[PDB]
Amino acid sequence: CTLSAEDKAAVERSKMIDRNLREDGEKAAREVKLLLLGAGESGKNTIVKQMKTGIVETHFTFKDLHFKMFDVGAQRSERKKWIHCFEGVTAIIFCVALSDYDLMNRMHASMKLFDSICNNKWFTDTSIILFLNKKDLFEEKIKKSPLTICYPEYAGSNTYEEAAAYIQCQFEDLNKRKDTKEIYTHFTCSTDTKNVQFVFDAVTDVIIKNNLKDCGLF
Amino acid sequence: SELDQLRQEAEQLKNQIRDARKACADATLSQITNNIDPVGRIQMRTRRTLRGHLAKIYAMHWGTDSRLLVSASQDGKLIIWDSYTTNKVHAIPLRSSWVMTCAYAPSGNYVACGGLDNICSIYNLKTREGNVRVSRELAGHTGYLSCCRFLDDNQIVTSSGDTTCALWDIETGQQTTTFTGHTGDVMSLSLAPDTRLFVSGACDASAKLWDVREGMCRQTFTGHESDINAICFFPNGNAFATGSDDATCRLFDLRADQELMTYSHDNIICGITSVSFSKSGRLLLAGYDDFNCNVWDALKADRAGVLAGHDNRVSCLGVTDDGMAVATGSWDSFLKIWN
Amino acid sequence: VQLVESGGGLVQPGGSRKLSCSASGFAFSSFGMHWVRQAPEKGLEWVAYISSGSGTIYYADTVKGRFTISRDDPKNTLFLQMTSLRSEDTAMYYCVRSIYYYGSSPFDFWGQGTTLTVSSGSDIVMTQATSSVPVTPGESVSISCRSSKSLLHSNGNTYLYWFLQRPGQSPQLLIYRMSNLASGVPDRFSGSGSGTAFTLTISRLEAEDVGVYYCMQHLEYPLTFGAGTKLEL
Amino acid sequence: NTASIAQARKLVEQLKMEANIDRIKVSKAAADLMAYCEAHAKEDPLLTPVPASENPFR
Amino acid sequence: QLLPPLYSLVFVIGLVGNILVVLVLVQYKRLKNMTSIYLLNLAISDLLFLFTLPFWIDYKLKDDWVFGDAMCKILSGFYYTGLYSEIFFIILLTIDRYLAIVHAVFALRARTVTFGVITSIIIWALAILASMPGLYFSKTQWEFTHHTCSLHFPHESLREWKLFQALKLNLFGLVLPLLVMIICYTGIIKILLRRPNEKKSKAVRLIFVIMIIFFLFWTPYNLTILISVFQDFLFTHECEQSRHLDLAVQVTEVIAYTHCCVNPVIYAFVGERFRKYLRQLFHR
Ligand SMILES: CC(C)CCC[C@@H](C)[C@H]1CC[C@H]2[C@@H]3CC=C4C[C@@H](O)CC[C@]4(C)[C@H]3CC[C@]12C
């Protein structure tokens, strides 16, 4: 058949390679891959320790799901040059420190970064899980130094239950694509055991929405 | 006062450089090559289609024998292909899935691969145990690697996302030389035919010509208005071409120190991802974000052909050392050989 | 890289025996394996072949239906089960690994072999028109061979391998296609040829290169070696 | 600022080393590019396609 | 000749729809999953069923069977195999969506190409066996006036066979599919309405439309087939109202062919990804 014996053995080797390529590429499509983001001094380090020099890949498992988080913190290069590599992740996990409103200020930088990524041309449909961390000491950092320092348009009370909700609604804005993606929000603390159940539920909802788009019900 | 005086001195030097360049220019390239015959429509058909990659293909490099080629994709895979029989010669699993570049040694013994982990891994293809093994892990950078090229089996030059180029020594594993001077992160490099010099383009819209032996920047070129993503020497070694995000290609010369041609069209508003010359140096292959590839002729910047048939961004593009075939990769996970 | 064969011994005719070959120090699963044998005083002849992943098996038509070759990948051993041993199946058995991709080196490492003693048409014939050549060190020799049909395929290759067996050891791959020097082999040996006529030239000899030089074809199956050419003195 | 002073000194030294080089006119570099493109025309399979006999990809 | 213009319209519309679905599913291989495999087979089942239309159209006007017994034994099999196959595939698409939405994590391991192909083969075998009586008892008999192609059973077993075919058509055509959709879709709507949204509202309306169309199109066919099986017990005189019962059979046959044309619209065209792929295909 115009093929020698060595050529036939070469083709057999190539196909035995193809089988392993298919097995690997079908095992890869069963893992959830979340992209961590956040500013300096945030909760990214803490949430990594609660859930589990370039990219830091963390692997863990929860209720028959295998997650792999890519902490890309410390990649201090032009973000507009390596972020299309992450086009196609299940969800983004954006950490924001609630205590950084007094210490422009850090909260405005976090809001600018959130507006930058949440409206990117590569994340027009990727869900976002907002983690508003460090509420334990934010509860006492508002007894003095009212929230008006950061947000001058705030007219509500200086209570935690209302200031935190105001910050949450100030963050769940900036989402110009309110029809393609959803912003999930959580008020966690350094000592919290439900931080992984929430991301599990959020990625379950993302998977269900992708399946609804796949089957054709959308 | 001293800082501002040095600033005014630098401005005076830049002005005298601009005046020297403007006094050197006497006739544009488009005025001398108006009499030469133009090339017809370059109809190029797809001969092969290497379909084993699953994620987006980010880099491909031809072997020196013009038959084998390596390709890298972010499913974590480095595949060595035989381009004649379409056979998969090797499949290398990477430790880091996020790669952006890959190189084939001019001897064929080693393959280099680098990405978002700030490491250039060197893999040995000709061990005695049968399988390919990682030989070295060059780790001295602080930003992502965007390109790498072998000078020989012992020296490799890598451009990084921390604005630094580095010439390494595979045996010892340390940076033999560090090239600095760019202000934006470097996106590509290109060795000359003779490996004395090499150019590199950065996100500050500049292309610097470094000398490998002395370790110094020899010349600098600025003609682009945005990030430079692709760079490639003319086969002669006395010119090169750059492709940036402003949807243009530009042909700089080394002995005249100024650009010569601009390859642009009104209907093209997407950035260039890759660029490569023909063997004669007449054609110019440029891969675009509009899912196409275009074929100019360098001597008179009119479009002579189009390579269509990819369903996503053309991410990598290479011409073979014979001038026989052109390989193009893309984000749709298919390599294609044209002829 | 090593291959250790075991089994052998004395067997009565019509009996059975299982020859084992334990591999050590290389990627066993990605290598195809061949069983070759050598009579007490004759040349080499190919016996069996099992490919990588056990997807292809070949026999010599002198043992077909009587031998069974089987590889075990987790436990690196390779087995040859032999039943109904006649009086012609008495020889030293070598295991040889072989890997097939573009530009590879098949038959690159031969085992040590084990001794088996029993009491009491369209093939390609490799013709080596010599049996013994007298020569002194420092001179240049030219061993020659010829084939029944053209070993040059349409794809440009010429599937002719040159081996070398030193006294009291296993064969060693010298040339792994017409004019392609193996690794670890000194640059004195040089292959050449055309069509059906091939030549192996040695520029200057030594004390560690006298012995029996064999030949082999890989264009079709079964694999046929020539009769050896002995270089002494 | 001492760091910025050293930065500006290195920059002006680089610009000085770069300003004093020899440059040929654009006419000569253009003629050389054209001559090299013309001298290697027939040895380019992509420019002038080879017959289907010696096309290794047919 | 009321039947032929209606038959020609369903034949063309349905054939055009099924061909478009097959081209988009085959061309875009990258979407090779359980949903695509089942959808490809549903389009095939409809094409095999629609295939029988020209023989029926032409035959009715002509009123003389121009074909052989073997041609008949094949066309009767195509018509019955087609009905059982499409109904079983609608049951599989319904189940596939159930797993994909409900038990979404489990489904990552359970919904694969391998299982979609094995399952599709089993259903086709069942559809073929279910239509086996029709293949066996098809006999074209030449009356002095004209030739009629039809099923014939031992007279002593005729009542048993008339009912047998009606029960296979009622149970695996209406009762089993309707039950599967009610259970499966109840479990989907309860997930869709857990979180309010405009796209969720659209998915719920689409689900009700699919359940209702299936029911309305198949409920007349099976009921009419059951009425025919009992003409002696349901009418004072045998064939007393054959003038209305035959017209009803012919009407319920047109409704069944129409349910074939509606199957691509409610299973493929409504889906967003599918419309996007068609737009690209049309420009390539
Ligand atoms: C009963 C007689 C008259 C007709 C029977 C034809 C049947 C057996 C044929 C027609 C079309 C065929 C199918 C065509 C496409 C597919 C999809 C593939 O992924 C698995 C096989 C499968 C499912 C085939 C199985 C056999 C098949 C169902």
Author numbering:
A (entry chain A): 3 to 54, 182 to 232, 240 to 354
B (entry chain B): 2 to 340
C (entry chain S): 2 to 121, 135 to 247
D (entry chain G): 5 to 62
E (entry chain R): 35 to 318
What's in the article?
CCR1 is widely expressed in various immune cells, and the knockdown of CCR1 has proved effective in suppressing the maturation and migration of immune cells, thus being regarded as an attractive drug target for the treatment of many autoimmune and allergic diseases, such as asthma. CCL15 is an endogenous ligand of CCR1 at which the N-terminal signal peptide is cleaved up on its secretion to extracellular media. In this work, we identified and characterized different N-terminal truncations of endogenous chemokine CCL15 as balanced or biased agonists targeting CCR1, and presented three cryogenic-electron microscopy structures of the CCR1–Gi complex in the ligand-free form or bound to different CCL15 truncations with a resolution of 2.6–2.9 Å, illustrating the structural basis of natural biased signaling that initiates an inflammation response. Complemented with pharmacological and computational studies, these structures revealed it was the conformational change of Tyr291 (Y2917.43) in CCR1 that triggered its polar network rearrangement in the orthosteric binding pocket and allosterically regulated the activation of β-arrestin signaling.
By using cryo-EM analyses, three structures of CCR1-Gi complexes in CCL15L-, CCL15M-bound and apo states were determined at overall resolutions of 2.6, 2.7 and 2.9 Å, respectively. Globally, all these CCR1 structures were similar to each other in their backbone conformations, suggesting a common conformation for G protein activation of CCR1 among these structures. Structural comparison of the extracellular pocket core of CCR1 among CCL15L-, CCL15M-bound and apo states was performed for the study of biased signaling.
